[model samples]
Target: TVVKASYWFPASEFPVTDIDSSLFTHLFCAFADLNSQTNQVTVSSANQPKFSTFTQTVQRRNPSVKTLLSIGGGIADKTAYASMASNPTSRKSFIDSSIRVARSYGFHGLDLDWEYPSSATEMTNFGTLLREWRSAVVAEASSSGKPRLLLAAAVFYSNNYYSVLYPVSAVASSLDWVNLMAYDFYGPGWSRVTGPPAALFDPSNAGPSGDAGTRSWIQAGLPAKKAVLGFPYYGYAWRLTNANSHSYYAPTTGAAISPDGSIGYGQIRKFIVDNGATTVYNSTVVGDYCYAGTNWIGYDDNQSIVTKVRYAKQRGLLGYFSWHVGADDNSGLSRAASQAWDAT
Candidate 1:
């Protein structure tokens, strides 16, 4: 069966208590950081209370749901991961501490979210890290007479994202799966023109899309069942240069709406109704966009998300997940996605 999952961070006002747990098979606690000084993973004091009871509290809603203590986030400090993975001594510290944290926190699994291992040297080390981690997990489980912790990584969409190859042999043998970040192809922050933040296909046939990334990972020797596609619960906002020009490739002055030009799906719904924005479902690319006057946003609504979820099921992939469940509109996208995957 597909693993329907989403992440929850301490900062997102979407309280962990509010998650519609029935819609998911797994939920990730966004971070347990790396203390560069100690080379150990630690959940902050502010987040400790939550981390400690995350598994207990969430199980109240769905007893079957598994919890994973996810380490790292946007902190794509290649240096941090590079240094840690390069040395066996440091890798053991990380492996032991992460295991200690996950067990103490009552998490069923652990996830490493290093945005990437950027160079050939780093990728080689990345392979070593996974192999060692798996070995430790197995030995620990055997010694303790418990099920081994599920191992997963939040990896770039393709094993080849950095133009360097992934140690696929190790990944296939060591990891239970990899959460493929199939979204974020374009955002108002970096893209000069407006486009889908997470499209299923590229109409232009040149740009990256969810499907393209998903295929690349599978083609790179990753089994379909081990690839979990990820979509965002939020979208990007752009400021159009001309109000008259409002389409997929419209001219953009810059980002709009909130800083960084990102808005939650819940906020997006409100924006559409409050401003009487015109919404378009561009199935050619399998994405949705909305514009009110010069302000525009690209996001996945129930329609687009359902389609993507269906893709995951139909293709026999591991399943799908959202970048977060926090940004969902009162479980709108979440429930839709859950239902979509099951229906297939």
Candidate 2:
């Protein structure tokens, strides 16, 4: 099945809006972080809340859709996760809080997007949490007559965070699927920001830039069929000092932010297309780029997305997943994703 999925929220605060549910099999909400004030949130051991008006709105908008709650994001409380994983009481507390909050509304599942958890001592703890979470949520949710609630985690593709987080063998068979963040093989956060959006066959550019994400998990006993390939609908841009020269990998200018104060891959592709620039693939980076002036951004578009889907199909992976749905322009990029997935 083509699991064309995305992460979306409808609050004016977040740009994601409702379009067609047909194109997406699942939607993972960004998440509600710990609220420090009233401490009304109960999902976390601390004061975090899994509650979201956006999630409730999404469920109402598309009742047939599976809108999951993705706990922990890029900026997460690692200490909280570690503590919850270590002690049984804390773990149960966290899991109980998760079920309490998840069931309060209508979340079909919960996704653990913890940035990392690597210690051998914590490894078993992580597995225990996953297993107990599955049992606790499903056993409780079955009364509602919905399918068994799902338990999934986003795994790191590279060894940098993989050593501790990618407990594939322990949890893969139990949970639904693992979302591998394949797009960040290169980004501005690093000393050098340039590389493949998502490469499967050949080596990609960026740090630990081989098929590190997928290969590592598979080697660790995770099944390819249960893995989802993550794609980026946006690009990374670095501020260039002068408009006369630029390099996708290393730019001397400075950090660049989009008009909306965020890096967008679709914006770069549309710019390239409108400017009559032809894409030139960087084999090292496993991505494509075209520069006319001093400005340059490395990204993946419909063409690159096609390659990514093909790679996923060739590897017999589960499906395609992207960072955020709102990043794409006017649903044009997502339309292209639909076309590409259907092409095969």
Clashing pairs in 2: 118-164, 157-213, 196-285, 234-265, 235-264, 235-265, 239-254, 239-256, 240-253, 241-253
lDDT of 2 by residue, 10-58 (tens): 3323443455555667778766443333222244433233344445555
Give the per-residue lDDT of model 1 (tens digit) for 257-342.
98778898899999999999899998988888999999999998988999998889888789888978889988999999988887
TM-score of each: 0.98, 0.82
- Once fitted onto the true fold, the runs of candidate 1 whose alpha carbons sit more than 4 angstroms away are none
Candidate 2 CA-lDDT value: 0.64
Cα error, residue 263 of model 2, in Å, equals 1.0
